[PDB]
Amino acid sequence: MPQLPSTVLDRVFEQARQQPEAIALRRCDGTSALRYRELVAEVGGLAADLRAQSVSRGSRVLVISDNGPETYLSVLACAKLGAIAVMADGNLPIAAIERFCQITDPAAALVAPGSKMASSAVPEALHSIPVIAVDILDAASLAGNADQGSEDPLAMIFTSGTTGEPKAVLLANRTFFAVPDILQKEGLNWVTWVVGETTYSPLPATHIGGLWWILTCLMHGGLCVTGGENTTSLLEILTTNAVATTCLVPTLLSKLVSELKSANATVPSLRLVGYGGSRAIAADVRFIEATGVRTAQVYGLSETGCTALCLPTDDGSIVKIEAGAVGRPYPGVDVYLAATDGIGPTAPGAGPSASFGTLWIKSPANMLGYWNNPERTAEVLIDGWVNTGDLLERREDGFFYIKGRSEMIICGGVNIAPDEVDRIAEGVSGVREAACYEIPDEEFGALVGLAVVASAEAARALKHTIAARFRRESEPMARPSTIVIVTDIPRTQSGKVMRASLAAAATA
Amino acid sequence: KKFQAMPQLPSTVLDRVFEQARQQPEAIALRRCDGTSALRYRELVAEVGGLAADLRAQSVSRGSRVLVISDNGPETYLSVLACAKLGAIAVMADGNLPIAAIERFCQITDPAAALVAPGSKMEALHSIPVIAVDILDAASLDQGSEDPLAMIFTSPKAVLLANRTFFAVPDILQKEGLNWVTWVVGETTYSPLPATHIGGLWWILTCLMHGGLCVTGGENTTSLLEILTTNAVATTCLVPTLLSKLVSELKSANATVPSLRLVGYGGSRAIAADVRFIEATGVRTAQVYGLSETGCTALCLPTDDGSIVKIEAGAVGRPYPGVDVYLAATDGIGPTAPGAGPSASFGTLWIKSPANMLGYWNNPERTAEVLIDGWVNTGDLLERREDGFFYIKGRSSEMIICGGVNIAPDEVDRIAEGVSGVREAACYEIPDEEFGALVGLAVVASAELDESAARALKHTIAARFRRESEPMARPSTIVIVTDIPRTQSGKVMRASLAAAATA
């Protein structure tokens, strides 16, 4: 906490002094590799180019990101000058870029090698400002910017709550280290960083999850692999690089689990997997923990500076994830459920957090505001609390759940017993096992979905067979609205269908 | 009701309009709200002829696509008809759409020319010839029912529409002598719905066929009532939002529309309270249910005794005679599919209608799954009730179930009414993906409150509710209304309120 530097850059430089020979960054295939000492000097080099080009404290620099080492050197060179690193995705069409430039008003632009052709249009489009190609230990080299603080802006991330508009999310230095400090200080192993361990982010540097993870790893002396992926196989990426920790979104975790099923392999080097963003699928998490690996669901938003709640691997955590738990609050991260919209956590007479309502979060990783948008900021951000927009319940177990707890489905006033539907679907020849799940419906409340594993005998015809069996019943609701032929149905070890894990797998 | 309805009548929209010109050449066919861009049936005929020449001069031919950059005015329907004369396909494109969007229409449809209506003055499409459009010879009066007349975008997906799309339903209504929807020769109609939207295009095109005086485009105002009033409009076609605004406009101004005979509406969830307001003014109404894919309305809910209760209940309509409907219990198994069984009383709505689309343009894979043997998958989820109508939801619990907890609407309103400053209150269900339903609360203020003033009422109600034993019961949203809709017993119409409250 207070013993440690209060900027990201300065924590990176500390690590570099402790282990200047360890690799800080490299791409998956091993190119663009920087040691901590080389990173330090490169950061020195690039910021001297930026100072030369008139970039000062408070200046915005557009970072056209390829997710690689050069992307992170670029952020750190901005940090060196007290400049704000605006993260722009290289893939995006120049019209999106120009719009970022309208909002942020950059003084320069830094272009990573993997966006360079797309970047190439930009220099002509961006005539007004110096746009630089980024390619590749005395105390003076390890000096930071003494005037920058924990509160000072380091980065901007674009988010689109609005269907068309993207808001520029303004992020202080503290965003990156506020939660890791909490963990270390309260001694929690929910998320851990081991000195030197290899990590991998398949998440873009322009997404809060990607930026946050690689930054906290740099501070912690990790070897961060990111950028030059030449395959879609995570298992190949993980194995080949002996990755120890990685940050996932559920659909990536699911693709990993399927890649490991399909090969009867594991990733033995792998220690820890964080995942978040979308709905967790207990089944994939469980398959991953069985294979030796510790996990952490990290719930959070760009506006909250990434994770604000956590669900670490522990007894019963899988049952909780399946029931819809998002996790529990880190110490020093206050959580408030507001029962009625328009009435914030600090409203006079509002009262204490309800156990059901919109989650508001007061964390020291919280964003400083939306760039150039006082009107949308004043509503989402108020006296330290960010409105996350999400509806959650707190149970007696202290965990937050994104849904309520009845063992029967309700479709148009009509109670469906899931087990009974499964029984019906399993009396049909060709069916090896079957399992129903709920499909959300605005007007009917819920519908019945049915997942089906066929015996070995194409079976598209079975769907028709099953459909016709349900047809011969006198409850119209009690009939599956969708019937998916699957290879497996997620089950507890005790043998019970994990219906929430199943619904997730069927709608992909 | 099974066979060809009116086979004596021409099988092209164009011919039917020309037929109108023959019978009433001096009657006004089209005009803008301000009275400019005016064409008589006679002049409409004449301009379609010269416009068609222009088109052929740019090598436009049968099957050639023609991009029609619409301003919803007389120049636009004139354009459509000029395409029709060559058997070219009118690709409807909104002329206020940003450049990139027009560009994709062009890449999708690849037209031989472009016709620009003046109400959107403005390369991008240099490569193709653009014609500016700017406003009886009996001999100058073989396209048929099935040839394509127009493309409408799902906006992106391109819906291919035949001529029969525009007369097949009205030929049925005529054939069966039904008055659900009717067109009177020479009556004034108005369409706030654009030519680029199935509703608007189909509406105006039907009126022209029927010898209507069609007022379209060039709105001199934002007031829907001033337009209807000033033009003495007799029939109109609306979406629920616009209907709500007409009602709102009608309440505030203490007016009726005296000329107004018929209002069609659809496109979103209908609001039973607005409909009832309108009909009490003497106006017949028809809910028209349909999509681009179904060539507009396939189901219709006509003003009738018990029609307001059905609409408040969530009814969408009953099919027209000759239009086939089929609820498939399971997705994937269509009507065609083997041993498909007959229609269920609940499931995904499939339609077999003579107005159905020919398919999506250059999309064989998506088309093959949505349209099979004349049947179209609407994608909508419905229940066929005892009374033969189709409904959007299930029979009411009368209880809001939030995360498994039952909540009493009477109990909730009781609480809000007990707060000083509340003259009356009524709650309503807000559907939720994860917790099922939330409680909404509509409040009628006892007294007027400054723009600042009302909110302390929101907090005070919120506070009061905060202090109750059950978390689920509490209103997730509190909205202030000058009006809570009631049945003629005085029970709250909670669905009408839930539509008005949300907006």
PDB file of C-alpha atoms in Angstrom, chain A residues 339-343 347 349-350 352-356 391-393 401-405 411-412 440-444 447 463-464 467 471 476-477 479-483, chain B residues 329-331 333 337-338 342-346 381-383 391-395 402-403 431-435 438 455 458-459 462-463 466 471-472 474-478:
ATOM      1  CA  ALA A 339     -34.193  -1.450  -4.855  1.00  0.00           C
ATOM      2  CA  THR A 340     -35.600   1.429  -6.894  1.00  0.00           C
ATOM      3  CA  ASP A 341     -33.936   3.038  -9.959  1.00  0.00           C
ATOM      4  CA  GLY A 342     -33.119   6.754  -9.706  1.00  0.00           C
ATOM      5  CA  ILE A 343     -32.361   6.497  -5.967  1.00  0.00           C
ATOM      6  CA  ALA A 347     -29.649   9.503  -1.440  1.00  0.00           C
ATOM      7  CA  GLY A 349     -33.241   8.723   3.475  1.00  0.00           C
ATOM      8  CA  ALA A 350     -32.450   5.916   1.034  1.00  0.00           C
ATOM      9  CA  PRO A 352     -28.868   0.668   3.837  1.00  0.00           C
ATOM     10  CA  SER A 353     -28.243  -1.684   0.873  1.00  0.00           C
ATOM     11  CA  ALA A 354     -31.222  -3.848   0.052  1.00  0.00           C
ATOM     12  CA  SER A 355     -30.690  -7.556  -0.478  1.00  0.00           C
ATOM     13  CA  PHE A 356     -32.237  -7.159  -3.979  1.00  0.00           C
ATOM     14  CA  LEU A 391     -29.704  -6.519 -11.058  1.00  0.00           C
ATOM     15  CA  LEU A 392     -28.393  -8.806  -8.291  1.00  0.00           C
ATOM     16  CA  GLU A 393     -29.618 -10.436  -5.099  1.00  0.00           C
ATOM     17  CA  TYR A 401     -26.579 -13.824  -7.634  1.00  0.00           C
ATOM     18  CA  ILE A 402     -27.639 -12.631 -11.070  1.00  0.00           C
ATOM     19  CA  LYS A 403     -30.901 -14.590 -10.762  1.00  0.00           C
ATOM     20  CA  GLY A 404     -33.474 -15.715  -8.194  1.00  0.00           C
ATOM     21  CA  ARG A 405     -34.076 -19.207  -6.864  1.00  0.00           C
ATOM     22  CA  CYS A 411     -44.623 -20.948 -19.242  1.00  0.00           C
ATOM     23  CA  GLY A 412     -47.811 -18.864 -19.646  1.00  0.00           C
ATOM     24  CA  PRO A 440     -35.939 -16.849 -21.289  1.00  0.00           C
ATOM     25  CA  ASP A 441     -39.097 -15.305 -22.856  1.00  0.00           C
ATOM     26  CA  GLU A 442     -40.323 -11.698 -22.532  1.00  0.00           C
ATOM     27  CA  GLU A 443     -44.039 -12.491 -22.921  1.00  0.00           C
ATOM     28  CA  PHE A 444     -44.353 -16.142 -21.972  1.00  0.00           C
ATOM     29  CA  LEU A 447     -39.975 -21.816 -22.579  1.00  0.00           C
ATOM     30  CA  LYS A 463     -35.614 -34.403 -33.268  1.00  0.00           C
ATOM     31  CA  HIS A 464     -38.729 -34.941 -35.394  1.00  0.00           C
ATOM     32  CA  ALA A 467     -41.090 -33.466 -31.292  1.00  0.00           C
ATOM     33  CA  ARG A 471     -46.947 -33.515 -29.572  1.00  0.00           C
ATOM     34  CA  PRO A 476     -48.926 -27.262 -25.169  1.00  0.00           C
ATOM     35  CA  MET A 477     -46.430 -25.455 -22.934  1.00  0.00           C
ATOM     36  CA  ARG A 479     -43.597 -29.244 -25.183  1.00  0.00           C
ATOM     37  CA  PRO A 480     -39.975 -28.324 -25.997  1.00  0.00           C
ATOM     38  CA  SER A 481     -39.664 -25.098 -28.008  1.00  0.00           C
ATOM     39  CA  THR A 482     -36.206 -26.163 -29.085  1.00  0.00           C
ATOM     40  CA  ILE A 483     -34.559 -29.550 -29.326  1.00  0.00           C
TER      41      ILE A 483
ATOM     42  CA  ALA B 329     -44.608 -26.515 -31.131  1.00  0.00           C
ATOM     43  CA  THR B 330     -40.889 -26.983 -31.909  1.00  0.00           C
ATOM     44  CA  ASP B 331     -38.507 -24.796 -33.908  1.00  0.00           C
ATOM     45  CA  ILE B 333     -40.079 -28.701 -37.585  1.00  0.00           C
ATOM     46  CA  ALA B 337     -41.687 -31.394 -42.206  1.00  0.00           C
ATOM     47  CA  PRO B 338     -42.584 -35.083 -42.138  1.00  0.00           C
ATOM     48  CA  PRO B 342     -51.508 -30.301 -37.506  1.00  0.00           C
ATOM     49  CA  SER B 343     -51.121 -26.828 -35.934  1.00  0.00           C
ATOM     50  CA  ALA B 344     -50.679 -26.642 -32.172  1.00  0.00           C
ATOM     51  CA  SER B 345     -52.537 -24.067 -30.086  1.00  0.00           C
ATOM     52  CA  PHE B 346     -49.172 -22.616 -28.939  1.00  0.00           C
ATOM     53  CA  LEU B 381     -44.328 -16.818 -30.478  1.00  0.00           C
ATOM     54  CA  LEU B 382     -48.087 -17.128 -30.114  1.00  0.00           C
ATOM     55  CA  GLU B 383     -51.041 -18.994 -28.605  1.00  0.00           C
ATOM     56  CA  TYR B 391     -52.393 -13.863 -28.451  1.00  0.00           C
ATOM     57  CA  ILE B 392     -48.951 -12.476 -27.651  1.00  0.00           C
ATOM     58  CA  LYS B 393     -48.875 -13.839 -24.085  1.00  0.00           C
ATOM     59  CA  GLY B 394     -50.384 -16.452 -21.785  1.00  0.00           C
ATOM     60  CA  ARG B 395     -53.450 -16.170 -19.577  1.00  0.00           C
ATOM     61  CA  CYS B 402     -40.310 -11.925  -9.149  1.00  0.00           C
ATOM     62  CA  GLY B 403     -37.583 -14.526  -8.616  1.00  0.00           C
ATOM     63  CA  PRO B 431     -40.458  -8.431 -17.714  1.00  0.00           C
ATOM     64  CA  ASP B 432     -36.930  -9.428 -16.727  1.00  0.00           C
ATOM     65  CA  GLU B 433     -34.623 -11.961 -18.358  1.00  0.00           C
ATOM     66  CA  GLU B 434     -33.117 -13.191 -15.053  1.00  0.00           C
ATOM     67  CA  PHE B 435     -35.648 -12.571 -12.243  1.00  0.00           C
ATOM     68  CA  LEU B 438     -40.127  -6.685 -11.786  1.00  0.00           C
ATOM     69  CA  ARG B 455     -38.688  13.462  -7.478  1.00  0.00           C
ATOM     70  CA  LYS B 458     -40.256   9.286  -6.039  1.00  0.00           C
ATOM     71  CA  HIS B 459     -37.802   9.105  -3.065  1.00  0.00           C
ATOM     72  CA  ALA B 462     -39.189   4.495  -2.588  1.00  0.00           C
ATOM     73  CA  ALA B 463     -38.417   5.058   1.097  1.00  0.00           C
ATOM     74  CA  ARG B 466     -37.825   0.241   1.330  1.00  0.00           C
ATOM     75  CA  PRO B 471     -37.338  -7.097  -1.010  1.00  0.00           C
ATOM     76  CA  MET B 472     -38.949  -8.538  -4.157  1.00  0.00           C
ATOM     77  CA  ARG B 474     -40.609  -3.209  -4.156  1.00  0.00           C
ATOM     78  CA  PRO B 475     -41.038  -1.159  -7.357  1.00  0.00           C
ATOM     79  CA  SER B 476     -37.826  -1.211  -9.432  1.00  0.00           C
ATOM     80  CA  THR B 477     -39.117   1.836 -11.284  1.00  0.00           C
ATOM     81  CA  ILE B 478     -41.445   4.703 -10.273  1.00  0.00           C
TER      82      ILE B 478
END
